[PDB]
Symmetry: C5
Subunit: 267 residues, 5 copies
């Protein structure tokens, strides 16, 4: 959908290349294919590496969200297995854990967490969380308070308390990894130039292809332009994995899966 526009332009520069062609020698222009085949292969190589980097940002982001689900399930498991009777702490903690993940989606989508927070917590908490530098980080400190007082209440050994504390550390690592990938994107520094280069190549290519491909120029030029531009825009979607493009991650579904898992695990 994004590239259909500029594919048709390339058909036009192709028609312009075909109409302008017989005049090359009157206009003084000689444009052979060998120099463009060298330039095109070097962009291919560079598009290959940039796409590899983008995808691996995607794969990392997906992996970090996988750990929210893994580590919330097993903190709840350890609670049910060591303090089975305290359904009261069960429910408090699960709300923090469910809050943490919706809070994190908003942080990364850069949207308002007030609604989701009120749906799950008391409004005194909702405002303690909204007041923080980082709500997600505030939610974790709160979830740790819940576990801390069970230790001070003697319901946990220092060993079974260390076991659950380690799961909140796993979520701290998820939080940091998501902020690194969010706020430190792939260097934009050249993404502007990284893309300027690929379309400049696609319009000039028919002008250099016609001499060989007299009337087939618009076909082979559009085929070539398709592949180069598809790869470059996938590279740019996948490179903001928390974005809202169609190939980005489905953070809403993932927060829902997370909610259903913990609620099913406590009630």
């Amino acid at each position: 959908s994004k590239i259909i526009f500029r594919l048709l332009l390339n058909v036009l520069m192709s028609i312009i290349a075909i109409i302008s062609y017989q005049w090359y020698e009157q206009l003084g222009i000689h444009l052979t294919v060998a120099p463009f085949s060298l330039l095109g292969i070097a962009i291919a190589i560079f598009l290959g590496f940039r796409n590899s980097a983008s995808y691996s940002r995607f794969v990392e982001a997906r992996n970090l969200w996988g750990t929210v689900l893994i580590a919330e399930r097993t903190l709840v498991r350890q609670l049910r297995n060591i303090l089975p009777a305290e359904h009261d702490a069960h429910r408090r903690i699960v709300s923090y854990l469910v809050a943490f993940s919706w809070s994190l989606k908003h942080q990364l989508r850069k949207t308002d967490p007030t609604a989701d927070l009120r749906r799950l917590l008391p409004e005194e908490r909702v405002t303690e969380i909204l007041a923080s530098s980082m709500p997600t980080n505030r939610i974790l400190l709160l979830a740790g308070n819940e576990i801390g007082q069970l230790r001070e209440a003697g319901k946990l050994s220092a060993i079974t308390y260390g076991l659950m504390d380690n799961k909140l550390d796993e979520l701290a690592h998820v939080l940091g990894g998501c902020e690194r990938l969010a706020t430190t994107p792939v260097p934009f520094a050249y993404t502007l130039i990284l893309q300027r280069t690929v379309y400049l190549f696609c319009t000039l290519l028919p002008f250099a292809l016609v001499g060989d491909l007299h009337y087939m120029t618009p076909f082979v030029s559009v085929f070539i332009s398709y592949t180069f531009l598809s790869w470059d825009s996938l590279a740019e979607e996948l490179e903001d994995p928390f974005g809202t493009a169609a190939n980005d991650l489905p953070l809403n579904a993932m927060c829902n899966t997370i909610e259903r898992n913990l609620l099913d695990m406590t009630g």
Copy 2:
């Protein structure tokens, strides 16, 4: 894969016998632009198959950890409570339930017969009532270990060491679920398949000038190696499938069960 090679032999034969008419419109196909495109395709094909490959390997890793963490959890119980064979058999049957249930979840098949062969039916009923049955099998197993802990037969220190093995099985379950629902992005294989198939049909048309009657044998050779490589990526999706090059999840589940049993004198 074998069908589209023949359409290529046809295209090349069409190109051969329609070659007379090439300058009628001034349509002319050079090899040069097609070798630029064929090289930009080989690169992207190379990178994609890389991701398909890494995805398949991760799934084999995950399943390998099942065997490892289950072997080592049963090892600890045998080494620490060599007397308590009742707990031995209980914990082994949950650990074997987990693999089978994970397999059935990944293949979206019913785990009921397997679960009943291993567990008492009250336990099966608790598991299948869950919207996440394999995750609940872990809660049960964690319970067996915990009452060994609450009955004083394990110290907090080794209880914690066994709980950690359960956390490893939890990472397998998550990673399988994440892989199952997170394919390599479809946009990748969409444009690879559009681009690879178009390029193979057009190719004999551009080879016919250079190779007069030789195009069918060289154009077919070129398209076989691109389609071989492209279809390798498709052999490495669905690692949890049932196909011949999909993982042998059943045989791996039998190995798991075979190990834990010979480990407890059965």
Copy 3:
């Protein structure tokens, strides 16, 4: 500074356009086929190199991501288990925060004394800066604070150990950042490939001008822009701790850390 070299190449082309006609008396012939073998090879090497430069920048960010993660969870641990002991909260947070600023000045080679005096008594600042490894001594002192809690019976040996592991993480960060700063990417990779990228871009028109006559500036400028752009991209990524817009925003990261740790302790 890269744009400068573009215009030199435009000149190399117009000189090569006018240098061209006399080529007879010296007998110099330059086809473009050999130059496409060399430009391809350079592009392969430049792509592999940029990959290494990007992976080094990424590891820099991960390192800094870990101080923020490790300092947050150490302070959360303190407030979760000793929520009364705010006299140790303030001392440790001040140590954690000074570790970050000291780490930053260390990587940027600037006087840290302002930040240290702003966060610690002049007794401390005199002591830390007397050491040859100031960031290492801050970790040592932060280790004392937890250790004194360990002897004061306020922490078990277990949770004393758990907080020790967070200082360990910060020890690995200090080491990793030091290792990135002292061990630059093998310089053989930067200027020897900078020279061959440079030589290649100027010598390119003199080999193009045969096939392209007055297009040569237009096409040679395009190619050179491509190579010099990608090569300059690897320039930036590969000194991640530098002071430059594209480089890591260390001052912001340290302010976020300080605001987070204080926000966790009012």
Copy 4:
């Protein structure tokens, strides 16, 4: 084994010369440009394939490394915690060494009887050999020894846990190696992926004569050597536990760790 295919390349090259005459007698032609597009595609796929093979080799290399690391530090812990318990030192050490040799035999699909019988008493050798997974049973036996030191009260639960971790590392090695052996990720495609390289290297002189009429054999086999080296080297690394020139020296590694452990308990 590959020098045979190189010589067929000089042969094919002589056919190309003495029959090129009659090629256009039919109107059949072979330029270089199509075979240069195809050879570059193959070279790209060879790089990626060799990248995957190599990373299989490095991982098998890291897992064997961990065997030596974990056996050394477990024996170190045993010596440092229980300096007096030499009978226990000796029993565990022979299990550790039995584990390594039995892992080598398991990966190479050879018989471990002689190494087991040199190191352990026959009641345990028949028990180990009876088992479904002998290396796994050796780990279980090593674990019983550490278990009875705990039940006898000679170890804290903590320091008993520090050594039990050492056994878990060896269990991860065992599983990683099992997966790197019976799980070539793709199979009978390497048959395709290398048959492709074989046919390209035979058709190459037919496509080279026109440009370079009798020089083809020297150029045709230079190129063939290049392509077939990279391919066979990929297949060597693909199977790191094999007996090839570029595969793992498991024997040197099993001998190093035996030598380390005897030197570590005062048997050298």
Copy 5:
């Protein structure tokens, strides 16, 4: 290096080709550049992949050595933090930790450690350390005897004893990874291929260049051979990161940094 030698011979093959192009028609050799473009690009792809592997193993070697400093630092931190009064064991452990790094240097450089060992430790210990097949291993065992005796004097708990024991496990992983990088290089086929082919390709190339370019052949055939040989010889450096070459890790300075960190941390 030895590279500049090989650049000058390319000036000879070119002038040879310049002055022997005369006889090409008479000798019946035709050498289009096109087939050499296909070989060159192939080799460039393989060289690109290989350099990556070389660079990776170099980066890993620097990483391993970086952990020596981290693990030794924090071990000394834990000792002061946990048993601040025991400056006597502080000094013995640190001399072991210092001997470990110097011995690790000698082991990787394959040089005698006796001098550095004599400088740092009593004579009975130097003899014991030099007897072992792996002195770095024996040094870790000795440092661990120190920690162990502090545990059986009741001066450490089982937990804080564990906290410090982990640091020695870390050091063992360092030893193991370094030993692994030192004994397991990139498979030598990777280079013999890339050494024979890159060299052979670099000299046959002007012979193909002369017909297309006649007297420019030297200038351009040299540019190409510099690019390939730079990239390939640089790979060879990065593959022996523990080598005594100029571009290899500066192991002596890292052992000096390590010795000075550890002395600064302990009063001196």
